[PDB]
Amino acid sequence: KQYEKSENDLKALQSVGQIVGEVLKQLTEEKFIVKATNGPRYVVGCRRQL
Amino acid sequence: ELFVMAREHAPSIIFMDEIDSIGSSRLEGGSGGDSEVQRTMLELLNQLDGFEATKNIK
Amino acid sequence: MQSGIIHAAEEKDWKTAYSYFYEAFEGYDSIDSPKAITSLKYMLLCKIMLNTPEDVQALVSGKLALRYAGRQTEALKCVAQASKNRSLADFEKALTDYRAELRDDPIISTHLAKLYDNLLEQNLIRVIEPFSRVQIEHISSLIKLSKADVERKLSQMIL
Amino acid sequence: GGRRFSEGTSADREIQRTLMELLNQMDGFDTLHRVKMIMATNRPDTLDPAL
Amino acid sequence: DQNVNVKVIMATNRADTLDPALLRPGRLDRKIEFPLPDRRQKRLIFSTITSKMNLSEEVD
Amino acid sequence: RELLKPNASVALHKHSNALVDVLPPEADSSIMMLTSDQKPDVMYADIGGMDIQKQEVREA
Amino acid sequence: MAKYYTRITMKRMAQLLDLSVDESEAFLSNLVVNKTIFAKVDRLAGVINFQRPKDPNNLLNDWSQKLNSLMSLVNKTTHLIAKEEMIHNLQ
């Protein structure tokens, strides 16, 4: 039980606390404009699994 | 501040239009918020440095 | 009366137009003028426009209508009858006599053209839709015209 | 909810702005049907003449 | 301004709403005034709105 | 690089330092809009009144 | 019936329904209005056409679709074939 918990815990440890944002305008699927919570607005992509 | 910037990139003509539609307690300070500013600017600038008979930022 | 014409023909607000025409009618009853009869047309006209022909029949206000009775009063009812029947022919006949009335006020001319044309269009859509190579007798019969008359009018429509 | 004010503190510009929102929601492009509001107020002469 | 779009439309409910930079003669060519008390309008508002919702037989 | 110069949104790299592409001035907008949603309890048709005013709005 | 047969004569349809040509015509008039399936029916008696526009466009798109699937099929089948081919382990 602890093995599963720790293995899943390593995957949490390598993984950061990723930037949360909001969609300012979706131009198309491949270019989305976001307002990131760190400050600077970014152009981001999307994964196809969404 | 306005004089130093104007002086740096000189000459300048500072066109102060004193419509004086500001306040209701700035019209008891000089009869315009802008007119209070203009009195400050006028008296100071006349006298300032050599800029009275070397004045060129009107 | 006049605010109603602009609303009805140009801006297409029949509701606001109806309401205008009522107020106008009330004011007209004291006098006799050509203006008074133009008010009578319009109230009836709004109903026909709605495409309920029953309302037209329910509504009739005889107060200005009887004075002026002749061709102008009857026209609004005949047009309604025609819409109800789904006959192009009733509409077709009526229109020729009526052309002086069409010239007199703009509102009637334009809306009657919409109605005639609309009616032809309704009748035709149902006739084509399940039959390709449909018989001439069948279009003559649904529209309610003679065989020669429908083909002629159709020629224009194809174009 | 207040008024225009704003020949004073940074609080004064802030009340007029917040007031703008209450106006829209009541009716000014958004109409009450999806959300409904009852406002409990101490002094009704504080609010806007519009409100 | 002078675009396919409507130019900025503004409303003010006070004489202290405005700013002299906005106010300046040489910015406003147009002045839209607005009355509202007239006897005519009152009848017109009532009949159109009454007509919007359903008609009764006690309609006057 | 001739459609580069207007003031509009654009993309730059953090540290691969290139103006990689250009983007429409449309992008960058956090403002919402209701074209006619949560519809006001008025219309031009649902009044008849403010006739004198009906010319002043129509034009503007 | 309408979905399978692109084309039937009016006459053949009567034999199929076991109702006369005139009765079938009236049924189709009602059917097309409900819009359960589109039909074109003639009073001439020539043909009843179901799902045909009479454009070359239909034939051009249809023609392409059959060829497009086929290529995909050959490449997948051979992967399994490779296993059979080895022999002396099945037999």
Curated annotation (Swiss-Prot), chain B:
Function (record text): Component of the 26S proteasome, a multiprotein complex involved in the ATP-dependent degradation of ubiquitinated proteins. This complex plays a key role in the maintenance of protein homeostasis by removing misfolded or damaged proteins, which could impair cellular functions, and by removing proteins whose functions are no longer required. Therefore, the proteasome participates in numerous cellular processes, including cell cycle progression, apoptosis, or DNA damage repair.
Originating species: Rattus norvegicus
Domain of life (superkingdom): Eukaryota
Subcellular location: Cytoplasm; Nucleus
Protein name in the entry: 26S proteasome regulatory subunit 8
Gene name of the encoded protein: Psmc5
The family this protein is said to belong to: Belongs to the AAA ATPase family.
Quaternary organization: Component of the 19S proteasome regulatory particle complex. The 26S proteasome consists of a 20S core particle (CP) and two 19S regulatory subunits (RP). The regulatory particle is made of a lid composed of 9 subunits, a base containing 6 ATPases including PSMC5 and few additional components. Component of a complex with USP49 and RUVBL1. Interacts with PRPF19. Interacts with TRIM5. Interacts with NDC80. Interacts with PAAF1. Interacts, in vitro, with the thyroid hormone receptor (in a thyroid hormone T3-dependent manner) and with retinoid X receptor (RXR). Interacts with ERCC6.
Curated annotation (Swiss-Prot), chain C:
Post-translational modification note: Phosphorylated by AMPK.
Location within or outside the cell: Nucleus; Cytoplasm, Cytosol
Cross-link Glycyl lysine isopeptide (Lys-Gly) (interchain with G-Cter in SUMO2) mapped to chain: 63
Residues of the PCI domain: 13-159
Coiled coil: none
Lineage top rank: taxon: Eukaryota
Ranges that cross the membrane: none
Family in the record: Belongs to the proteasome subunit S9 family.
Assembly description: Component of the 19S proteasome regulatory particle complex. The 26S proteasome consists of a 20S core particle (CP) and two 19S regulatory subunits (RP). The regulatory particle is made of a lid composed of 9 subunits including PSMD11, a base containing 6 ATPases and few additional components.
Function: Component of the 26S proteasome, a multiprotein complex involved in the ATP-dependent degradation of ubiquitinated proteins. This complex plays a key role in the maintenance of protein homeostasis by removing misfolded or damaged proteins, which could impair cellular functions, and by removing proteins whose functions are no longer required. Therefore, the proteasome participates in numerous cellular processes, including cell cycle progression, apoptosis, or DNA damage repair. In the complex, PSMD11 is required for proteasome assembly.
Protein name (database record): 26S proteasome non-ATPase regulatory subunit 11
UniProtKB/Swiss-Prot annotation, chain E:
Subcellular location per the Swiss-Prot or TrEMBL entry: Cytoplasm; Nucleus
Top-level division of the source organism's lineage: Eukaryota
Subunit record text: Component of the 19S proteasome regulatory particle complex. The 26S proteasome consists of a 20S core particle (CP) and two 19S regulatory subunits (RP). The regulatory particle is made of a lid composed of 9 subunits, a base containing 6 ATPases including PSMC4 and few additional components. Interacts with NR1I3. Interacts with PAAF1. Interacts with TRIM5. Interacts with ZFAND1.
Family (UniProt): Belongs to the AAA ATPase family.
Chain's role: Component of the 26S proteasome, a multiprotein complex involved in the ATP-dependent degradation of ubiquitinated proteins. This complex plays a key role in the maintenance of protein homeostasis by removing misfolded or damaged proteins, which could impair cellular functions, and by removing proteins whose functions are no longer required. Therefore, the proteasome participates in numerous cellular processes, including cell cycle progression, apoptosis, or DNA damage repair.
The name this protein goes by in its record: 26S proteasome regulatory subunit 6B
Organism: Rattus norvegicus (Rat)
Organism phylogeny: Eukaryota, Metazoa, Chordata, Craniata, Vertebrata
Gene name tied to this protein: Psmc4
